């Protein structure tokens, strides 16, 4: 798995590959790893697919019930709910989740919740087995307040390299853009990103 | 076991082989792996056969009660949600790997679900020991906008690949077609490409061949009057 | 909090009467008339859809309910009590039978389970009895067609034909004159409609009358083909049009 | 403990049980009675893990005595053996199972028949003309298979039992310090004090 | 709080009587009469259904006589729904005993168990008692044919002949008059039906108002047979005994 | 150590023309030690027959459990349980112990009293139903039984021909298994008569 | 006479505590109305802010239960909010368990079942509220389902609740007797709201300012309440013809 | 009247009669006085005997080295509440290495008493308590009522005829608050205060009970000949 | 009759008399008020000096919940403390799960549902307090008042206790004369005046004034007690207005 979320001038974009493996067998080559827990709060999942799906479903439920009572939750609140589940059940979970969301007050925000269930607010985050190979590239190429097109290129190039080196990553590069304008889904095929 | 699911124009088709095994021994040569969750929601199971049957009947039972409670026809996403939350709770100990397909007022659906509770969406799926043989066929011949006839053909061909190439699979192909605005048609033994040839010899014994010590009538009737 | 009513609310009076059961039966008496008639090849259950307001959509209120594919129920008395009993009856048919034997319960045993639930509301702590009498019609392989009445006490009786609620006394007399052991289902439906007309004041048509039958298997209502032994539900609710057709031959 | 034998003859059941109690290195006792009278005409011998044997036997004894008082009636050997089997079958799936094997020798006063039941710690019950637990059967069953007759007298049963014990004393590596022998018949239970 | 509405179902009166038990017995005195008669070669159970209708499906109807197992049956007087709760519990007790000892439950042990359950509702729990009186007809190989009765107090007693329900005073006097120890089942059948015929509050005793059962060793050889009489069979025995 | 092969034993069932047959060996052992030659593994509840192989304590427990349940069934239903219904009851009962199972291999045989149709079914220890048209096998010599049945069996055998087929299937399978044998019983079941036959076989 | 204090039967087979809970329903002296359009379901309710010290924005008897379901309540606000919180919890749980949004009629049935329990169990009192649930259901379309303290519920073409429900009900009845259809034949929800307000004005015989009303609108995939300025625009359109 | 059957019932005027009846038990109790300066806090209690053969019922209970109380009313209820205070003082020391503030102790006693006034089955406590203590903010005196009301005071009195002592303390307020660094004079003021509540009987050697806590003074109770000095 | 003997019983009117009797206990309590200002809220309460022996400024009545919410109540003081203890548990669990401090409307419903729950059963007694509370959250200032029935609304100004009618009239003048709004420092002064004016209903004994406030500019949105010079300034302003 190769996943990342990057804040930019107009908000935040989540990116992911689409490969799900059972050992060396690709059980699903068109997986959607970008998961909606609220209208403009999404997450990238890594680790046990069962665990991260279970967690995400519970979070989506919590934020739906939150919204009915208190109105739209902040991205921080969503990250807190994710963290509560991941931290308190750390012995029985294998989940690495990146939470990304857009407020109008706070704009684009990214929170990463690694294995232990700690929370880390970052300008951008990378996770999954493929992320190891792009720490160097991402650190050298990330800038704050990039444009939408620059951020799409940054994620596309980054995940391209992650896919290139990581056997557990591959397929299509999916992206979800979170801004004031709304929610936009993007997809990029191998013939596009492999020639980068 | 080889099970597949294939989406088409106006619905979805699932298929399965009919061999159930205990290690290297074939327990049943004509096993029924296509299970009904509700009239138009069917699924096929691989893994622990009792678990696939039990989890299907439990969710099927609760789906029926839910349908009666809500005065609505059951949805595939409900069966999926109930199945995955049940399986997740049991942390993989219930060894049910299912391909869940069906039609409902929302449309036609195809999902896979693993014993750990993880689910997936697709236009074509395969599960079981013969899934790699089946997926090879599906990856070679699947296209968008398949007709009903093309999907049945593709699904059964994928099962055949499992039958012939996977030792865990064999015997016959069962199919179930779920089309929007129609009754689901269950096609038991859709293909029968493994009929045993006539034996060289009849092994019917002469009467009185077996040595007998005692004979007696067994009273299966209840205590009698008078 | 905690339910601190752990004592019976139904008790024996000096005369031996169980007051709350008697009063539940009084509530049933005030209820709209419902009836059941058993034929040789089917059972019919019927009632009036007493609409509380003309702005109300009375089709959304089901007085006749499917319990199993071969068992249906109707009531007289308190509607809400009936609705929850139908929920419990549907569930108990699965939990205490179908999940054990892989088949739906026979009519008499489902009736027995419903009766047990109603009996317990008559003895358990901090509850009142159910204010309904039920008429449960059904079919099963070994008992054939049957019709049962279940009262607030939990007592149940099998009937050839009967009526409960408002005009039950007059209706039962009407049924006694008309019933014989050679009735076909269509004859029973005809008698049901005749009997029900006497207790209905206002409009008498397919929109104001609710009627269902337990009869032949309906393979068209099964929802799937391919299993020969599965032939479809015997319970079928008659449409507004189907009722009106038989009201011309009335 | 170690060797427990049983033989059902014409009119009685005979139970033979070793006297040794060994705690690892030392033989702590050489006169231990590995049996409990459950009712006037029902005797149970036992062997298995230390502590659990006596605890189980006395627990069964207490229960049968309770039944006897409540109903003013002695349960048949068959009924007692079924009760015992269920307790062991229940026990085997417990948190800590009773590691106890038993022989139940009883005289049925209704049928006027001796009855011997063999039940292991799993709750495996069999009615036998003769039985044993542990390795005792391995040494003795070939002798019992040869000499046993259903019409044997009590004295002939004891003689066949002596031959079994002699073979045990010859070929068994452990010194089980002889056996206590008890006879169950229509008159009740008695101990053969010279064996 | 809740105390205000508590009837206190399990208290003594100043005279040392249990209010609810006494009132439950009053309820049972209005139930249809049930009679049990024990003979040397079997037991008879006869019981009157309460004012019935012509539209009642009699052949599938059961309100009085119930099977507990193959050897033991009961006649019910009181609330039928209450009785079915206890009957199912008794059926389970019998099976529990059979599983445990691999022998059919002795009649008295079953009777004592049900009676103890009734007793519990009079001493603890604050619930109303079961408004039921049972006549137990049964056979075991210890005491042979046995008749018992139990009532809401949980007290039980053994009988040669006994009635419960309505008009027990009149019924018991009639039974006491004509019962003899060397009596046979066919004679007991006649006594039971004659007694009901005289004590009934109905105008006449007919087949559609009766439930009937016999427990006989009239089962081929060393075994016992229960016979729950069919409507036609009750009609025949009424003609045979000369009541209709 | 393996609970399903401590005591040993086998059961086989077959369908014929308007008849079914169910048969079992009589051995109970403690691994190598033969303990009993009268341990019958076939039981019946009304007209429905149940064979059970595996751990002997569970064999006895399940028989007592199904006698318990079919007795209550009969009291409430006012009729004897049918093979199809009983099969579901066995499956339900086994699966309720999914994570602490009875170590058994049950086999149901019988004729539906209303349809007259012959019925057989097999189960794994946790309730999965094998409803074969031809034959069902179970026990420590199930491989041997599969081999015998697959070659010896032909459909629509008359009761007295089916007896020879099932007897020879059992006997020769048992003689290739150390933990099976020590006698054998065969039930021939017709709609309203059942014949029980004890077979003569080698006692080693 | 303790049969009047708890939910047990009176000698007439009546439940007085249920009947008295119906009377508590009108304690707020507020009337509500619900009607269905082609694509929408509109609910309007009187808004009375009798104290000048109150923050009028917090005075409401319309609740957003889920994204799709709205609920107006007739009865005291404590019981109203009790029911609101429960309905929200039930709707959220439903979606989690069954993987789709809880239908309006199913929620109504669920809340009706809960109410039924209070009429049968002695330790729980009935809630003194009538709950009108509205949505545009994905299967049934525009939906009005109303629940009461007896545990009764039913679907409506249109409905009214409050002290003057009869006047509004008859007014609505007369309109649907003319049109002979089960809904307001109008494309936009704005005009369905205008219809609802107009017919409440006619039935009650009172004029309304923007602060005298409260409006909830259900469309496909969302329920929302109108602001005072949205209502003002509605009132202006009504006056201009 | 119709509203005094239990603690869960308000009267039509909004009163809780069971609580008021519990308050009445305190008025029947023997008089006890509390007063403090800026360095010390003192309890004085008139102990009551059953007869001339009996002992005099103890009135003062130590809760910690820095805190304790005197009681008036049902003595077993005081034992329950003082035990609770001991535990709470102890919890504070063990978990937080912190001496429990007297004001916080009052809040805990209030909340414990309150739960017995709003629930069915229970009853209010039938005792009044005067809690003295020396913590990080100096000397403190609290008055506890079983209604739940806890009040911080310079001085007070509860029990029968407590009004006489309370008026005296209200007069002497400006004098006794200034008695700093002189334990004996503060006790004298308390003994003189409690004397305004005596009738027919006077303070004897087994009648009088005195407690003191202060800056460098652990909570200590004086009985017997230890109080003869003050008689 | 007998409908008023048990909580949660509906009278034939549809009334819960036990709740109405709880209101009588509230009306018997001292006067407490709340004033919503431009960027916050001000709470004030009348503390009756029963005796000279009461230590001044020690028996604090106003309570903080979390760090941003103030609570004051009239009636049975212990009941109010019990409610605040629950509120503190509610606020803690909210912040634990959602990270952000509990919003004031959210907090209002938590108290509301809890108080309403004590009108559902006869095994509990209704709260004998009306609670005025509020503070600053992400959407600004909020003032609430909560009754024994569980009923609560948002307020511009709120008053309860024995002198509530007097106080309300004073609050209504402020609302009319300041449509643009009141400053936090003005509100503190006005709160002092209103309590002094409302003390006419309790004129027998003298009293002690206690004021607190949460203001975005003056206290950084945290609840603080008005102490020392600012309190004295408010007391002086109040004393000047009554003369
Ligand atoms: Cl529900
Ligand atoms: Mg896991
Ligand atoms: Mg790759
Ligand atoms: Mg062999
Ligand atoms: Mg051998
Ligand atoms: Mg209630």
């Amino acid at each position: 798995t190769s996943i990342m979320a990057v804040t930019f001038k107009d908000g935040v974009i989540l990116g992911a590959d689409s490969r799900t493996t059972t050992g060396a067998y690709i059980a699903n080559r068109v997986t959607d790893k970008l998961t909606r827990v609220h209208d403009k709060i999404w997450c990238c999942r890594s680790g046990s697919a069962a665990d991260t799906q279970a967690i995400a479903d519970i979070v989506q439920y919590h934020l739906e019930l939150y919204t009915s009572q208190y109105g739209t939750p902040s991205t921080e609140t969503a990250a807190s709910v994710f963290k509560e589940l991941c931290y308190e059940n750390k012995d029985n979970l294998t989940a690495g989740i990146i939470v990304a969301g857009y407020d109008d007050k706070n704009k684009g925000e990214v929170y990463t919740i690694p294995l232990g269930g700690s929370v880390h607010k970052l300008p951008y985050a990378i996770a999954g087995s493929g992320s190891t190979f792009i720490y160097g590239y991402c650190d050298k190429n990330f800038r704050e307040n990039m444009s939408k097109e620059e951020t799409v290129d940054f994620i596309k190039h980054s995940l391209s390299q992650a896919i290139k080196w990581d056997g557990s990553s591959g397929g299509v590069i999916r992206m979800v853009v979170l801004t004031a304008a709304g929610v936009e889904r993007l997809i990029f095929y191998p013939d596009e990103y492999e020639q980068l | 076991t080889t099970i597949v699911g294939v989406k088409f124009n106006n619905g979805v088709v699932i298929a399965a082989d009919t061999r159930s095994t205990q290690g290297p021994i074939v327990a049943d040569k004509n096993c029924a792996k296509l299970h009904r969750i509700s009239p138009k929601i069917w699924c096929a199971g691989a893994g622990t056969a009792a678990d696939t049957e039990a989890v299907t009947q439990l969710i099927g039972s609760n789906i029926e009660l839910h349908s009666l409670y809500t005065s609505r026809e059951p949805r595939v996403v409900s069966a999926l949600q109930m199945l995955k939350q049940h399986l997740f709770k049991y942390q993989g100990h219930i060894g049910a790997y299912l391909i869940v397909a069906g039609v409902d007022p929302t449309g036609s659906h195809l999902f896979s679900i693993h014993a750990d509770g993880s689910t997936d969406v697709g236009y074509y799926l395969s599960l079981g020991s013969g899934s790699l043989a089946a997926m090879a066929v599906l990856e070679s011949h699947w296209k968008q906008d398949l007709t009903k006839e093309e999907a049945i053909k593709l699904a059964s061909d994928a099962i055949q690949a499992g039958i012939w190439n996977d030792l865990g699979s064999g015997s016959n192909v069962d199919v179930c077609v779920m089309e929007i605005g129609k009754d689901a048609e269950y096609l038991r033994n859709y293909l029968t490409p493994n009929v045993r040839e006539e034996k060289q010899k009849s092994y019917k014994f002469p009467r009185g061949t077996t040595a007998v010590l005692k004979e007696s009538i067994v009273n299966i009737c209840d205590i009698q009057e008078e | 909090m905690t339910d601190r009513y752990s004592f019976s609310l139904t008790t024996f009076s000096p005369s031996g009467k169980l007051g709350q059961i008697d009063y539940a039966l009084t509530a049933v008496k005030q209820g709209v008339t419902s009836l059941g008639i058993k034929a040789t090849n089917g059972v019919v259950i019927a009632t009036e859809k007493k609409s509380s307001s003309p702005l109300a959509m009375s089709e959304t209120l089901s007085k006749v309910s499917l319990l199993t594919p071969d068992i249906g129920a109707v009531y007289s008395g308190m509607g809400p009590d009936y609705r929850v009993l139908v929920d419990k009856s549907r569930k108990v048919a699965h939990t205490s039978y179908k999940r054990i034997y892989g088949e739906y319960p026979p009519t008499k045993l489902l009736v027995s389970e419903v009766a047990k639930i109603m009996q317990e509301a008559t003895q358990s702590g901090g509850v009142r009895p159910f204010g309904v009498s039920l008429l449960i019609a059904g079919h099963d392989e070994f008992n054939g067609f049957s019709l049962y009445q279940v009262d607030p006490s939990g007592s149940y009786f099998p009937w050839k034909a009967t009526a409960i609620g408002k005009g039950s006394v007059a209706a039962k007399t009407f049924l006694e004159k008309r019933w014989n052991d050679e009735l076909e289902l269509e004859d029973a439906i005809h008698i049901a409609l005749l009997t029900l007309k006497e207790s209905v004041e206002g409009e008498f048509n397919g929109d104001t009358i609710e009627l269902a039958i337990i009869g032949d298997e309906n393979p068209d209502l099964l929802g799937y083909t391919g299993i020969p032994t599965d032939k479809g539900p015997r319970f079928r609710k008659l449409t507004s049009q189907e009722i009106n057709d038989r009201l011309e031959a009335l | 403990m170690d060797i427990i034998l049983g033989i059902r003859v014409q009119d009685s059941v005979i139970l033979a049980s070793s006297k040794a109690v060994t705690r690892g290195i030392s033989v702590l006792k050489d006169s231990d009675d590995k049996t409990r009278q459950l009712s006037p005409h029902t005797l149970m011998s036992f062997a298995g893990e230390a502590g659990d044997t006596v605890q189980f036997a006395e627990y069964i004894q207490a229960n049968i005595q309770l039944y006897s008082i409540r109903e003013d009636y002695e349960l048949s050997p068959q009924a007692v053996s079924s009760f015992v089997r269920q307790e062991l079958a229940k026990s085997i799936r417990s948190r800590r199972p009773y590691q106890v094997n038993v022989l139940i020798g009883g005289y049925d006063k209704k049928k006027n028949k001796p009855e011997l039941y063999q039940i292991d710690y799993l709750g495996t019950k069999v009615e036998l003309p003769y039985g044993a637990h542990g390795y005792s059967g391995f040494y003795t069953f070939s002798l019992l298979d040869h000499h046993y007759r259903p019409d044997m007298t009590t004295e002939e049963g004891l003689d066949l039992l002596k031959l079994c014990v002699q073979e045990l004393e010859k070929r068994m590596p452990m010194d089980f310090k002889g056996v206590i022998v008890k006879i169950v018949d229509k008159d009740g239970i008695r101990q053969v004090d010279d064996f | 709080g809740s105390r205000r509405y508590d009837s206190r179902t399990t208290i003594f009166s100043p005279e040392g009587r249990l209010y609810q038990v006494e009132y439950a017995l009053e309820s049972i005195s209005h139930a249809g009469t049930a009679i049990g008669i024990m003979a040397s070669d079997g037991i008879v159970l006869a019981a009157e259904r309460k004012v019935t209708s012509t539209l009642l499906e009699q052949d599938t109807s059961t309100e009085k006589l119930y099977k507990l197992n193959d050897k033991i049956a009961v006649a019910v007087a009181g609330l039928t729904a209450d009785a079915e709760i206890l009957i199912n519990t008794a059926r389970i007790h019998a099976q529990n005993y059979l599983k445990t000892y691999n022998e059919d439950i002795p009649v008295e042990i079953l009777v004592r168990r049900l009676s103890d359950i009734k007793q519990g509702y009079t001493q603890h729990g604050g619930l109303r008692p079961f408004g039921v009186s049972f006549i137990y007809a049964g056979y075991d190989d210890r005491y042979g044919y046995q008749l018992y009765t139990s009532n809401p107090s949980g007290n039980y007693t053994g009988w040669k002949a006994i009635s419960v329900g309505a008009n027990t005073s009149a019924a018991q006097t009639l039974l006491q008059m004509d019962y003899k120890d060397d009596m046979k089942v066919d004679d007991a059948i006649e006594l039971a039906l004659k007694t009901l015929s005289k004590t009934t509050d109905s105008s006449a005793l007919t087949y559609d108002r009766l439930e009937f059962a016999t427990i006989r060793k009239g089962a081929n050889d060393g075994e016992v047979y229960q016979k729950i009489f069919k409507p036609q069979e009750i009609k025949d025995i009424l003609v045979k005994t000369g009541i209709t | 150590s393996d609970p399903s092969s401590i005591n040993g034993g086998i059961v086989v069932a077959m369908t014929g023309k308007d008849c079914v047959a169910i048969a079992c060996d009589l051995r109970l052992g403690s691994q190598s030690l033969g303990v009993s030659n009268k341990f019958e593994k076939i039981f019946h509840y009304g007209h429905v027959f149940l064979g059970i192989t595996g751990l002997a304590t569970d064999v006895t427990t399940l028989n007592e459990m199904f006698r318990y349940k079919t007795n209550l069934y009969k009291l409430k239903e006012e009729r004897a349980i049918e093979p199809e219904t009983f099969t579901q009851l066995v499956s339900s009962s086994l699966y309720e112990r999914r994570f602490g199972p009875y170590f058994v291999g049950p086999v149901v045989a019988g004729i539906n009293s209303k349809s007259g149709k012959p019925f057989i079914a097999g189960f794994d220890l946790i309730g999965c139903i094998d409803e074969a048209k031809d034959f069902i096998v179970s026990g420590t010599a199930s491989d041997q039984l599969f081999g015998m049945c697959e070659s010896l069996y032909e459909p629509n055998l008359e009761p007295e021909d089916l007896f020879e087929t099932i007897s020879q299937a059992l006997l020769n399978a048992a003689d290739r298994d150390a933990l099976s044998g020590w006698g054998a019983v065969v039930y021939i079941i017709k709609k309203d008569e059942v014949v029980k036959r004890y077979l003569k076989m080698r006692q080693d | 006479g303790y049969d009047r204090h708890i939910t047990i039967f009176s000698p007439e087979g009546r439940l007085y505590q249920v009947e008295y809970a119906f009377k508590a329903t009108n304690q707020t002296n507020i009337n509500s109305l619900a009607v269905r359009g082609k694509d929408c379901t509109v609910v309007i309710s009187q808004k009375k802010v009798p104290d000048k010290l109150l923050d009028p924005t917090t005075v409401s008897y319309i609740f957003c239960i889920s994204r799709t379901i709205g609920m107006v309540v007739n009865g005291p606000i404590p019981d109203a909010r009790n029911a609101a919180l429960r309905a929200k919890a039930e709707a959220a749980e439903f979606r989690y368990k069954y993987g789709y949004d809880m239908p309006c009629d199913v929620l109504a049935k669920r809340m009706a079942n809960l109410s039924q329990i209070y009429t049968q169990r002695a330790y729980m009192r009935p809630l003194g509220v009538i709950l009108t649930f509205v949505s545009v259901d994905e299967e049934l379309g525009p939906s009005i389902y109303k629940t009461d303290p007896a545990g009764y519920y039913v679907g409506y073409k249109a409905t009214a609740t409050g002290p003057k429900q009869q006047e509004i009900t008859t007014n609505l009845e007369n309109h649907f007797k003319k049109s002979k259809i089960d809904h307001i034949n109008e494309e936009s929800w704005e005009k369905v709201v205008e219809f609802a307000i107009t017919h409440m004005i006619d039935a009650l015989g009172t004029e309304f300012s923007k602060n005298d009303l409260e409006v909830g609108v259900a469309t496909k995939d969302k329920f929302f309440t109108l602001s005072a300025e949205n209502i003002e625009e509605r009132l202006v359109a009504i006056a201009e013809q | 009247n119709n509203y005094d059957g239990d603690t869960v019932t308000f009267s039509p005027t909004g009163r809780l009669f069971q609580v008021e009846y519990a308050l009445e038990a305190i008025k029947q109790g023997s008089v006890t006085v509390g007063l403090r300066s800026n360095t010390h806090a003192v309890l004085v209690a008139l102990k009551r005997n059953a007869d001339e053969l009996s002992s005099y019922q103890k009135k003062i209970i130590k809760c910690d080295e820095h805190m304790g109380l005197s009681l008036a009313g049902l003595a077993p209820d005081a034992r329950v509440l003082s035990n609770y205070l001991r535990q709470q003082c102890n919890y504070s020391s063990l978990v937080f290495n912190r001496k429990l503030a007297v004001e916080r102790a009052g809040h805990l006693l209030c909340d414990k008493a309150q739960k017995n006034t709003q629930s069915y089955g229970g009853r209010p406590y039938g005792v009044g308590l005067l809690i003295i203590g020396y913590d990080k903010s100096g000397a403190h005196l609290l008055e506890f009522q079983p209604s739940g009301n806890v009040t911080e005071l310079y001085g007070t009195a509860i029990g029968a005829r407590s009004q006489g002592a309370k008026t005296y303390l209200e007069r002497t307020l400006d004098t006794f608050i200034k008695i700093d660094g002189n334990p004996d004079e503060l006790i004298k003021a308390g003994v003189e205060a409690i004397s305004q509540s005596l009738r027919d009987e006077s303070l004897t050697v087994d009648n009088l009970s005195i407690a003191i806590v202060g800056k460098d003074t652990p909570f200590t109770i004086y009985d017997g000949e230890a109080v003869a000095k003050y008689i | 009759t007998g409908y008023d003997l048990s909580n949660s019983v509906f009278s034939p009117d549809g009334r819960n008399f036990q709740v109405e009797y709880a209101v009588k206990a509230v009306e018997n309590g001292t006067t407490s008020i709340g004033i919503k200002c431009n960027d916050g809220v001000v709470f004030a309460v009348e503390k009756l000096i029963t005796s000279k022996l009461l230590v001044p400024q020690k028996n604090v009545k106003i309570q903080v919940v979390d760090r941003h919410i103030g609570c004051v109540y009239s009636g049975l003081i212990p009941d109010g403390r019990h409610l605040v203890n629950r509120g503190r548990e509610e606020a803690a669990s909210f912040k634990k799960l959602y990270k952000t401090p509990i919003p004031i409307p959210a907090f209002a419903d938590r108290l509301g549902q809890y108080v309403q729950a004590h009108t559902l059963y006869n095994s509990v007694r209704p709260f004998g307090v009306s609670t005025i509370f509020g503070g600053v959250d992400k959407n600004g200032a909020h003032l609430y008042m909560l009754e024994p029935s569980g009923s609560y609304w948002g307020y511009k100004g709120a008053a309860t206790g024995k002198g509530r009618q007097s106080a309300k009239a004073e609050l209504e003048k402020l609302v009319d004369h300041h449509p643009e709004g009141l400053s936090a420092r003005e509100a503190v002064k006005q709160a002092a005046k209103i309590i002094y004016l409302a003390h006419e209903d309790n004129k027998e004994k003298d009293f002690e004034l206690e004021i607190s406030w949460c203001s975005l500019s003056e206290t950084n949105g945290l609840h603080k007690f008005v102490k020392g010079d600012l309190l004295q300034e408010a007391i002086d302003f109040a004393q000047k207005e009554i003369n």
Side-chain angles (χ1 to χ4, degrees), chain H residues 177-181:
Chain H
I177 191 59
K178 276 169 150 60
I179 304 174
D180 299 340

Coordinates of all heavy atoms in Angstrom, one line a residue, chain H residues 177-181:
Chain H
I177 N -11.6 35.2 67.2 CA -10.9 35.1 65.9 C -9.4 35.5 66.0 O -8.6 35.1 65.2 CB -11.6 35.8 64.8 CG1 -11.1 35.5 63.4 CG2 -11.6 37.3 65.0 CD1 -11.1 34.0 63.0
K178 N -9.2 36.4 67.0 CA -7.8 37.0 67.2 C -7.0 36.1 68.2 O -5.8 36.5 68.4 CB -8.0 38.4 67.7 CG -8.1 39.4 66.6 CD -8.5 40.8 67.2 CE -8.0 41.9 66.4 NZ -8.5 41.9 65.0
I179 N -7.5 35.1 68.8 CA -6.8 34.2 69.7 C -5.8 33.3 68.9 O -6.1 32.1 68.7 CB -7.7 33.4 70.6 CG1 -8.7 34.3 71.4 CG2 -6.9 32.6 71.6 CD1 -9.7 33.6 72.2
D180 N -4.7 33.9 68.5 CA -3.7 33.2 67.6 C -2.5 32.8 68.5 O -2.1 33.6 69.3 CB -3.2 34.1 66.5 CG -4.3 34.5 65.6 OD1 -5.4 33.8 65.5 OD2 -4.2 35.5 64.8
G181 N -2.1 31.6 68.3 CA -0.9 31.1 69.1 C -1.2 30.8 70.5 O -0.2 30.8 71.3

